[PDB]
Design a protein around this motif. Structure first.
Motif, mmCIF file in Angstrom:
data_model
loop_
_atom_site.group_PDB
_atom_site.id
_atom_site.type_symbol
_atom_site.label_atom_id
_atom_site.label_comp_id
_atom_site.label_asym_id
_atom_site.label_seq_id
_atom_site.Cartn_x
_atom_site.Cartn_y
_atom_site.Cartn_z
ATOM 1 N N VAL A 1 56.346 -0.255 22.662
ATOM 2 C CA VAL A 1 54.999 -0.773 22.883
ATOM 3 C C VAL A 1 54.529 -0.464 24.300
ATOM 4 O O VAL A 1 55.258 -0.650 25.281
ATOM 5 N N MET B 1 45.949 1.097 31.156
ATOM 6 C CA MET B 1 44.818 0.491 31.849
ATOM 7 C C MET B 1 44.154 1.498 32.776
ATOM 8 O O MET B 1 43.709 1.162 33.877
ATOM 9 N N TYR C 1 61.066 -1.385 19.902
ATOM 10 C CA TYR C 1 59.631 -1.207 20.079
ATOM 11 C C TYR C 1 59.330 -0.331 21.289
ATOM 12 O O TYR C 1 59.903 -0.510 22.366
ATOM 13 N N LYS D 1 66.058 -11.028 7.227
ATOM 14 C CA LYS D 1 64.779 -10.625 7.803
ATOM 15 C C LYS D 1 64.918 -9.379 8.668
ATOM 16 O O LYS D 1 63.979 -8.580 8.757
ATOM 17 N N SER D 2 66.072 -9.195 9.307
ATOM 18 C CA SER D 2 66.345 -8.042 10.156
ATOM 19 C C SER D 2 67.634 -7.347 9.734
ATOM 20 O O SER D 2 68.448 -6.945 10.569
#
Ligand SMILES: *[C@@H]1O[C@H](CO)[C@@H](O[C@@H]2O[C@H](CO)[C@@H](O)[C@H](O)[C@H]2NC(C)=O)[C@H](O)[C@H]1NC(C)=O
Ligand SMILES: *[C@@H]1O[C@H](CO)[C@@H](O)[C@H](O)[C@H]1NC(C)=O
Ligand SMILES: *[C@@H]1O[C@H](CO)[C@@H](O)[C@H](O)[C@H]1NC(C)=O
Ligand SMILES: *[C@@H]1O[C@H](CO)[C@@H](O)[C@H](O)[C@H]1NC(C)=O
Ligand SMILES: *[C@@H]1O[C@H](CO)[C@@H](O)[C@H](O)[C@H]1NC(C)=O
Lengths: 52, 106, 47
Positions: free
Chosen positions: C42, C46, C40, C32-33
């Protein structure tokens, strides 16, 4: 005042009288929500990806 | 050199990509997908109908918009909802504009 | 193979047998990896 009185929202206005003031009265208000910088509740979920 | 894959105007997703270039070597360049989503924080389930309450859920399916309701208003197309206006005993059914300066007549 | 079995993260080795190979077989493992570490960037504004 009691703590429970401060927990409830009360104006608790302060009045100052002086001759040098234009209207001779200065009024100030305070409560529990006075000041109180904004509280952030970032609850982020990131394990649902599980590595694509 | 930033390339725009897709861009949903009324969702304001702006999915882009760029290949950053390091020194010349066997391939270690970092491929990135860059998005810029503008959450409204004040829009409703219908951005046109005021009656619906504030929407808390914010759903963003990337594949659904790469290929219906949305959150962000548009500057080009008009959002018109029917609204009642009353003068006296009788009423007349009239149109309105939800947002100003968007698509005013020219 | 079923996609649910892929999401479990099995070895899924592909053993290739040939005469020219020094050990006569050679296999690679996918997962999967198995590719990039996928860091990330990310961010949440605000303003
Ligand atoms: C909230 O959204 C719904 C989405 O279906 C809307 O209902 C219809 O929306 C279309 C889109 O222009 C209109 O032509 C119809 O007249 C709407 N239906 C009704 C009964 O008005 C609408 O924006 C909202 N729903 C309601 C019930 O007002
Ligand atoms: C802050 O977030 C946590 C986690 O979601 C939640 O349990 C808690 O009630 C929140 N506090 C608030 C909203 O004041
Ligand atoms: C992501 O980072 C790169 C720098 O490597 C930058 O050019 C790009 O604009 C960033 N993405 C966004 C959406 O700002
Ligand atoms: C997140 O990780 C990458 C990988 O090194 C790094 O370049 C980036 O600056 C990090 N983000 C922040 C906010 O430090
Ligand atoms: C994303 O990572 C790059 C590293 O290539 C870094 O320069 C950049 O500042 C990061 N973006 C942020 C922190 O918003």
């Amino acid at each position: 005042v009691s703590e429970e009185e401060w927990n409830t929202g009360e104006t608790y206005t302060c009045v100052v009288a002086h001759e040098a003031l234009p209207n001779r009265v200065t009024e100030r208000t305070v409560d529990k929500s006075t000041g109180k910088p904004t509280l952030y509740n970032v609850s982020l979920v990131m394990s649902d990806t599980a590595g694509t | 050199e930033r390339i725009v894959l897709v861009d949903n105007k009324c969702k304001c997703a702006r999915i882009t990509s760029r290949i950053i270039r390091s020194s010349e070597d066997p391939n270690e360049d970092i491929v990135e997908r860059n998005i810029r989503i503008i959450v409204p924080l004040n829009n409703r389930e219908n951005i046109s109908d005021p009656t619906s309450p504030l929407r808390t859920r914010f759903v963003y399916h990337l594949s659904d918009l790469c290929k219906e309701t949305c959150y962000t208003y548009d500057r080009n197309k008009c959002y018109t909802a029917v609204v009642p206006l009353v003068y006296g005993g009788e009423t007349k059914m009239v149109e309105t504009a939800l947002t100003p300066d968007a698509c005013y007549p020219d």
